[model samples]
Target: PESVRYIKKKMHGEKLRKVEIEAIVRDIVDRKLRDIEISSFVTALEINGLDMDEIAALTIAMAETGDMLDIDRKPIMDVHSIGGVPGNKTNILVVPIVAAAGLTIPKTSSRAITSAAGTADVVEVFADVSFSLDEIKRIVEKVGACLVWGGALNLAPADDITIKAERALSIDPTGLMLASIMSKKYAMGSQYVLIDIPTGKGVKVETVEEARSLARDFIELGKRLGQYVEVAITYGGQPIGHTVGPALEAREALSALMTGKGPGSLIEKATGLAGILLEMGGVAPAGTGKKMAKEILESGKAWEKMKEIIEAQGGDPNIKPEEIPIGDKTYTFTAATSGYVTAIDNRAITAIARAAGAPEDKGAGIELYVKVGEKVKEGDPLFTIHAEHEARLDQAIVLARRTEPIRIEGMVLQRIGN
Candidate 1:
């Protein structure tokens, strides 16, 4: 049994040390902490934020409860998004881009909790997402980069315990989110990390001020944890690109790397983050990084690196996007009475995709036929929903009609003072 005094002390806003946190987390790992007790512990942290030293202690203590990757590499770079919007598949493209720029990037991503899919979900369509830490180090050493799932890796077991409880309670303590991300990065031996904070309505961080505040926290936490961290405050007003399924997103990401083309939003965001990594690695000067990133992307070396990573991670190196199958059944959503497409609802799109079966059904997903601000005619296609089961497809159809995921407004994009 956990000391009632320690739990009661945190509940009363009394300070706890690193060792005290370890005691609580030890019970959690051993499954001795009752679910009710776990929830209360998280709730207490949510109510009383941890100070900087406390944050460091908690992050390090959590990292201690798992196996750490002791890779013999330098300037090991990484790109991660605190993702919210649907179809934010930028990590799929960012890895190859950074590797092509001549840096060691071992990216360990998570599975989808509440989206169409996550980086690992999408990547698993092509590569093996599960790997031992030894396998990951070997892959990165051989090919300069690897993209794999984090959940099974046991990089920070306590984070899994805390985050699961936090999600159930709908309480996201700022200090805990920071600890979760930084602890994993530190455990993975990341030398540099770029975090994406997508801010907008229907997203995690709602405004620029909110994103910047979180960014400052990341910067400070990174310094304390001994890694260089940079944040990109990106617009999260809508989904990142047109494709929002596991297999579909994997195909789209490959298409972007191989053809040097994709949704303008996806391409810009991936390279923008990759460019920062290039500058961090001294592969390109700060002002020149984006151009260099674009050049590597266009020259197709990134596409080649993608093959190396895929092959190293037990996937077909020569696989093509068309070869990745989508659902055999699909349904189209069209504009009811079109003026111009004004918005694509992120949550709505996610709901539709999940209904169709996302992380569970690799062949299932949604493809956008129209983006925000595009002119459209009545009955013009807005998007396509795909599913393996007719029932799932129908569920998505019903949800799309009920939610109207695409919004069309009259005189869309009209200037305010024209």
Candidate 2:
């Protein structure tokens, strides 16, 4: 079969033609390709990465295999993150903020596959996220935005098939990442795209250089695919905010939107990205998008917009953040000695949160009491772990201690080898 031939060529480090890539996608969608064959194809791409043109071909091929939304709206705005860090619930904030500016942003998000919580998981705490294409269109048209799960929409169906193998192997190949992201954006009919590339140690794109290169790939690909793309390299060294699970993160987002107050990191990242969208959508002029977004949030317009969005999605618009339920069982970690926090391990935070049964339990998560570079004394609370089950809570605490998720350093230099 052509799919098998192309897979062999890809495995041999040989580039495939556009037609061959399209054939693979069609075979994937038609169930003509076996699971092992698909895994081999993904593994080959992971080992021997595809170039820009090949990735573009793969993106278009996958996008063409499913439904493409044609919402009758101008300057359809969208934002996406190559996600890895935990507690990054900016989507909940970004959608309402951008939509409050009177822009059309039909945002589709994913459930957590490898992290504590995804945007879809967190948003589910507020309202139903699974909606039909027409439903999404109507909701967006009415409220100016709708946050729904992408998996149920059948947009870029082939990428979903490939993602299964990618998840099983725990590998995120660059070509597949680019293609997966762009294809969905392409299928969603997004005209103005803003890709957030979080960069830091233990994050997906660890270095600035790598993030910049990937940004260029997204920009160049968008040009070929007829979209205006921009990229933001945000800090990803630690978890985004004080929380790291669905319910907890959602509460944080809601609290911020309602009171216009929360962790600075969460507010900065959300408004920063939303600001870019405002500029791209021509809602705000260049260099002033962030100010406008902050103003909207502070002036209570974003919160009001969020209420409309929640109501449109069949949720109670008046639900308060404090009304959100969280895990009952809790354990707080205190500083064992006096020192300053040097770093917080992103991978460790994710592991601990997952151990606590995060996205599944909804309430299970970690809440940070201190950020990096903060001073702490012995017995000062560092972070607290919450879980629905006592056993999971214990497991999470054990993991947190063993992993030393937060690192602290003393002022004195070893006391002269005392």
Candidate 3:
């Protein structure tokens, strides 16, 4: 396919046609495009965004460019998160919780693109996330769910390349994002999908209005691609749960499912999202989905199912909370002034995690000790930074403090409703 040479030309900041975009992506999957060419294509896309139709066409091209998984199960369901929030280990809870209700959820998750932890990273703490297509199918069939890394399966390889490039430039091309998401969902054989669009300060969508608009576009795109898609734009101001790092988040997930207690936020978000899965699967009524999910979690069924899944995937079923490995060194960020917490910056926290060696380090991240509207003393801890190296830790501390990740003020709200 002369894709390599053609993409090389496009990589030189040359504008590419829709056909050219498809060709480059196909070449990427075939390993015909070099890293430079790939980076160039990504940069070009970032500088000049693709139109809706171009994106749709690109998505189809990427979907057909990789290996497709046939789960051999009827009504296969999946969930995706356009992640900007930290500590969203919903995959750990949602997959098993839904699977516990006797539904097939072959969850193919990704590594961290721009956050402290991705689904695969957190899932890796409890079980092996890397699995072959056959292994994934076997586990999903036996346990009704499995959280495995998407890259290992050869599913939508072109989309994976584009994701890497997108992260490099910190650009979320609307058309590209839609294509990347739908392509993977379609290739994975998902008939229904629930997309989590976390919106708030420091997230992808800064306002509820923006989130709603993105959700609508996602659903419309899904409809065009023959998918039953539902989008849930949730609160994304701060971290979702009490934990943020991979091991800690995994522990929180286990504790939440096992003891039926941890952070109410985590439980609320998980149940709300998992309930939708139940409703979609026809196991529960639409509005009664949350209740059904609660029953399953409180009955010790979700935890048990998760254990079965872990064992099936060659993970330690008896993974104690303390047994999960974390970073060796940690630094606590204390409140500089005594005041009411006004805001928690997700971007600052994410930057600190990256500086502290997250994603690559696996164990490095920031854990929020305080939430919005909480009062704090001058010396009280606001968050803790985990890192593999002392130099990175120091760098992260400097960045976090400089950015004022958590802003404290005397009053919670300056203006009141009329």
Which residue pairs in candidate 1 collide? none
Model 2 off-target regions past 4 Å?
12-14
Ten residues in sequence with the least summed lDDT for candidate 3: 6-15
lDDT of each: 0.85, 0.88, 0.80
Can you rank all candidates by TM-score, best first? 2, 1, 3
Between candidates 1 and 3, the one scoring higher on TM-score is 1
- Cα RMSD of all models vs. native, in order, equals 2.7, 1.5, 4.2
Ranking by lDDT: 2, 1, 3
Q: Mark the 10 consecutive residues where model 1 has the least summed lDDT.
A: 409-418
Residue 52 in model 1: lDDT: 82
| Candidate 2: worst-modelled 10 consecutive residues by lDDT | 409-418
Candidate 1 C-alpha lDDT tens digits along 77-169:
878888888898888788888888778888988886877798889888898888888888888899989888888888678778777788788
For model 3, how does the per-residue alpha-carbon lDDT over 144-191 read when each residue is reduced to its tens digit? 788888867887777666666667767776877788788888887588
lDDT of 2 by residue, 192-305 (tens): 999888899898888999999888888889987889999999999888989889999988999999989879999989998999999988988999999999999999899999
**lDDT-best of 2 and 3:** 2
Model 2 TM-score on a 0 to 1 scale: 0.96
How good is model 1 by TM-score?
Answer: 0.96
Question: 295 in model 3: Cα distance from truth in Å?
Answer: 1.7
Stretches of candidate 3 exceeding 4 Å from the true structure = 1-28, 31-54, 163-170, 411-418
Clashes of each: 0, 0, 0
